[PDB]
């Protein structure tokens, strides 16, 4: 009913060896998602992959990525408090409203590439870019979730962990080849872009084997409602030879990307990922009004503690 300073409400998912429950912070009144995991039911490999996901989450703080707030660990349990996405998955949006206009699709795609480019700047590949992993906030703003298959990478070297959902997997992962990290995400962005503008998969079938033959063929239909600039973009990301796919920077400079009205917010956000490198006094005053010491709020913020002090500040800021 109440885990720490959070009051448990509806269950937003029950999967693998964990249960994600939507809960409210008792003091800040913020809407959060607490992934509850029993460390006494997981095999050693799965527990360590969960600990590695938390570290990767602590590195990825972006407006279009689900923000980790608090990590509460006991001797047998682990609770993972993260930002709650009100608008649900982008998959459930496409099922309910169909394909988006290239104006809506372009706006949401820019937010996805903004987070993917930021991942690859810190040398982190998501490796599971699905439309079910693209969550939406109250105003339908993209929020990349599920850094489950994500891992570090060295630019120029090849990865070998064959993971990723089949309808979005690149043909290298189907064949079981040592692939390049970012090109495997660029193929996933090719599938995601097509799903946003058509409301259907580029590659589909009755079974996984039918779908597998489809992805390996590289042939997909370009519809009448799809513009020439959009067709060129998708076609140059869904390429069988990875060495012939557009880079994350080429995707940003694509003619389709500059087709809307001038977007200075997008250019500023991708410029902050090539540069990488402010305490809200109104929040610190409210925390001191309650009783949360300023010295412990600052210590927990700089040491990446993700504790009661660190979480109350961040939740109060957002």
């Amino acid at each position, epitope marked *: 009913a109440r885990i720490g300073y959070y009051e448990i409400d509806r269950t937003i998912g029950k999967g693998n060896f964990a249960v994600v429950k939507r809960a409210t912070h008792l003091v800040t009144k913020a809407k959060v998602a607490i992934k509850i995991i029993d460390k006494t039911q997981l095999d050693e490999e799965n527990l360590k992959k969960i600990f590695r996901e938390v570290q990767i989450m602590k590195m990825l703080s972006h407006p279009h990525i689900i923000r980790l707030y608090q990590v509460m660990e006991t001797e047998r349990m682990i609770y993972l408090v993260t930002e709650y996405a009100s608008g649900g998955e982008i998959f459930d949006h496409l099922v309910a409203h*169909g394909r988006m206009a290239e104006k809506e699709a372009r706006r949401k795609f820019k937010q996805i590439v903004t987070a993917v480019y930021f991942c690859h700047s810190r040398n982190i590949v998501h490796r599971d870019l699905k439309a079910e992993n693209l969550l939406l906030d109250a105003n339908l703003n993209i929020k990349i979730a599920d850094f489950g298959f994500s891992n570090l990478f060295t630019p120029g070297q090849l990865l070998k962990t064959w993971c990723g959902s089949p309808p979005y997997a690149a043909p290298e992962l189907f064949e079981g080849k040592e692939y390049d990290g970012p090109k495997v995400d660029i193929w996933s962005l090719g599938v995601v872009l097509y799903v946003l503008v058509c409301g259907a998969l580029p590659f589909d079938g009755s079974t996984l084997q039918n779908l597998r033959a489809r992805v390996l063929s590289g042939k997909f239909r370009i519809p009448f409602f799809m513009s020439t600039e959009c067709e060129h973009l998708i076609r140059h990301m869904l390429v069988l030879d990875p060495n012939k796919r557009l880079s994350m920077e080429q995707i940003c400079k694509h003619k389709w990307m500059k087709l809307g009205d001038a977007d200075p917010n997008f250019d500023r956000l991708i410029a902050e990922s090539q540069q990488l490198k402010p305490l809200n006094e109104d929040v610190l005053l409210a925390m001191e009004d309650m009783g949360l010491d300023k010295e412990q709020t600052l210590q927990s913020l700089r040491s990446d503690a993700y504790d009661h002090y660190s979480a109350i500040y961040s939740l109060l800021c957002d």
Partner: single-chain antibody, 236 residues
Framework: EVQLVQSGAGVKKPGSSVKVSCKSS???????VSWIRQAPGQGVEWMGG????????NYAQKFQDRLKITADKATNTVYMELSGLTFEDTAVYYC?????????????????????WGRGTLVTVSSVLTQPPSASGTPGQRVTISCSGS????????VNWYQQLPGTAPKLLIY???QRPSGVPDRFSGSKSATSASLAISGLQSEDEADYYC????????????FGGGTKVTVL
């Protein structure tokens, strides 16, 4: 008691769009409803619908450009929108539910049989499987309807048979090649041999005067359910 309620008959002008709804009553969630249309005097053709767990929706190549299939899971409603209408889109639009949804993981190949059917919506716009066009027999005889496909559809998938009584929506008669749904008498038998399928109606009765269609999923491209041209069975 589970039935598929459809929206009313519409008269549309050229270039306009039409939206047809399909509300499920009696149970409750997870359906896999598809949209199939039937031109006046012509056979039935699959337009699009839920065909796998992977994507939000699947469309036949012919309808992808003008069809938008949506679903309000909060009200058990499934919608269909066809834009850029012409007199050739004047047809009886049906919504039909796939019968084996309850078994859909990633490896199970669906039979793609239409368990339930809607009454049909009359849409009027202001201006693949080889089957014999007709079959006849005297009461008591046995008639056999041939249905030929290719290795991409019948060769690699199950065959279904539908009976469409004059003026009604089609009804599932045979599923999974040989299976007779509850109510279908043992007089009707289905069979399949490599890329061919057959329907035998033994002890032919006056009540058997209907159009019969064979249907099998085709693995070409994103996949589609292909229907036969239909066989009108008359009794003498």
């Amino acid at each position: 008691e589970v039935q598929l309620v459809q929206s009313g008959a519409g008269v549309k002008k050229p270039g306009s769009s039409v939206k047809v709804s399909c509300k499920s009553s009696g149970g409750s969630g997870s359906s896999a409803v598809s949209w199939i249309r039937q031109a006046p005097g012509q056979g039935v053709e699959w337009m699009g619908g839920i065909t796998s767990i992977f994507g939000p929706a699947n469309y036949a190549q012919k309808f992808q450009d003008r069809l938008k299939i949506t679903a309000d899971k909060a009200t058990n409603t499934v919608y269909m929108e066809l834009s850029g209408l012409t007199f050739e889109d004047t047809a009886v639009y049906y919504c039909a539910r796939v019968g084996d949804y309850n078994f859909w993981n990633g490896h199970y190949r669906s039979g793609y049989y239409f368990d339930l059917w809607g009454r049909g919506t009359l849409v009027t716009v202001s201006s693949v499987l080889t089957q014999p066009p007709s079959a006849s027999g005297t009461p008591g005889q046995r008639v056999t309807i041939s249905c030929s496909g290719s290795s991409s559809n019948i060769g690699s998938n199950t065959v279904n048979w539908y009976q469409q009584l004059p003026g009604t929506a089609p009804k599932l008669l045979i599923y999974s090649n040989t299976q007779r749904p509850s109510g279908v008498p043992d007089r009707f038998s289905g069979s399949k041999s490599a890329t061919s399928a057959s329907l035998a109606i033994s002890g032919l009765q006056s009540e058997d005067e209907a159009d019969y269609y064979c249907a099998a999923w085709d693995d070409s491209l994103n996949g589609h359910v292909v229907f036969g041209g239909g066989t009108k069975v008359t009794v003498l």
